[PDB]
């Protein structure tokens, strides 16, 4: 619920997270910023790739 | 050894006590914490950069340190440190066996050269507490 | 070629922090020599933590035998500053752009640097 738009989805039958439709973050520090309150520091990493658009 | 109470050395300063025990009870066992105080500067605003706990057992106590040695530790991006601290919070022996309640207490003398004891004021539903660091 | 060379164990971190994405000094305790050093290592890009082993080397240049301004390969936190205050136990005070250098040991240890010179700041964490 974090995540402003819809990028990580909840999987059912594994009961874990998935990455779907990944081209919609919008670059919104807002998934890392609720890892780092939960005291997960390094759990989600997000970086621009420079030779794709 | 001698003592369960162990000192924080850095915390955030707009934490309050609800939530450390919070940590500590998720990250130890479940109310496995007895007493956590924080030191303040002022009245009821403003609380000081360390901390004193008191834990129940010393084998909690054993595996905080271990955690806390291995830098395992990380409320709200700060590491705790744990260290020894000089007196404990309540005076309360860490022993599941030296704590007596409801029990008869009673005072008197000797009464005659036989083994008789007489009984001046009987109290009931007492508690004993039996010290050995402090003698008492 | 590498004028200094020994194993430190790190003993505090000064913001003692994870995210705080800023510069955390750091105080190594040297072995077998008793030197206390002093640093400022970014631990976003360069993770340490409390109780990890590393070691440190300082030479004057990074070729090999002359060549004053390939230890590329070997070590992984290759750094230049400068020497600027060696009077203080002595103590030497290097600025790497900015991020000071505090190396507090012996007398007999620290001897072959010259005041206001290039020196490089070699680290490996094993």
Same mark, same amino acid.
């Given at each position: 619920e974090s995540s402003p738009t819809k990028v990580f989805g909840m999987d059912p039958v594994t009961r874990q997270v998935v990455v779907v439709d990944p081209e919609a973050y919008t670059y919104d520090e807002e998934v890392i910023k609720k890892a780092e309150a939960m005291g997960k520091p390094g759990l989600i990493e997000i970086s621009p790739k420079d030779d794709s658009f | 050894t001698n003592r369960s109470t162990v000192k924080i050395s850095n915390v955030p300063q707009t934490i309050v006590a609800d939530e450390l025990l919070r940590f500590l009870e998720l990250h130890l066992g479940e109310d496995t914490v007895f007493a956590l105080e924080i030191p303040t500067t002022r009245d009821n605003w403003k609380p000081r950069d360390f901390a004193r706990v008191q834990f129940t057992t010393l084998e909690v106590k054993s595996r905080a340190q271990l955690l806390s040695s291995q830098s395992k530790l990380l409320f709200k991006t700060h590491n705790l440190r744990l260290s020894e601290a000089y007196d404990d919070i309540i005076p309360r022996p860490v #022993? +599941?066996?030296?704590?007596?309640? #409801?029990? /008869?207490?009673?005072?008197?003398?000797? %009464?005659?050269?036989?083994?008789?004891?007489?009984?001046?004021?009987?109290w009931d539903g007492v508690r004993c507490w039996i010290l050995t660091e402090k003698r008492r | 070629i590498i004028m200094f060379e020994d194993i430190f164990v790190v003993?505090?971190?000064? +913001?003692?922090?994870?995210?705080?994405?800023?510069?955390?000094? /750091?105080?190594?305790?040297?072995? !077998?020599? %008793?030197?206390?050093?002093?640093?400022?290592? !970014?631990?976003?890009?360069? +993770?340490?933590?409390?109780?990890?082993?590393?070691?440190?080397?300082?030479? +004057?240049?990074? !070729?090999? #035998?002359?060549?004053?301004?390939?230890?590329?390969?070997?070590?992984?936190?290759?750094?230049?500053?400068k020497l600027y205050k060696i009077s203080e136990k002595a103590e030497l005070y290097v600025s790497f752009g900015g991020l000071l250098m505090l190396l507090q040991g012996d007398p007999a240890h620290i001897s072959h640097f010259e005041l206001d010179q290039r020196l490089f700041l070699l680290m490996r964490k094993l």
């Open positions: - | #022993d +599941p066996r030296k704590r007596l309640d #409801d029990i /008869v207490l009673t005072v008197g003398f000797p %009464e005659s050269d036989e083994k008789r004891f007489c009984a001046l004021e009987k | 003993d505090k971190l000064d +913001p003692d922090g994870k995210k705080f994405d800023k510069v955390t000094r /750091v105080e190594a305790r040297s072995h !077998n020599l %008793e030197m206390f050093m002093h640093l400022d290592v !970014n631990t976003e890009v360069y +993770p340490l933590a409390v109780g990890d082993k590393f070691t440190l080397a300082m030479a +004057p240049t990074l !070729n090999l #035998d002359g060549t004053p301004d390939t230890l590329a390969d070997k070590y992984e936190y290759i750094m230049h500053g």
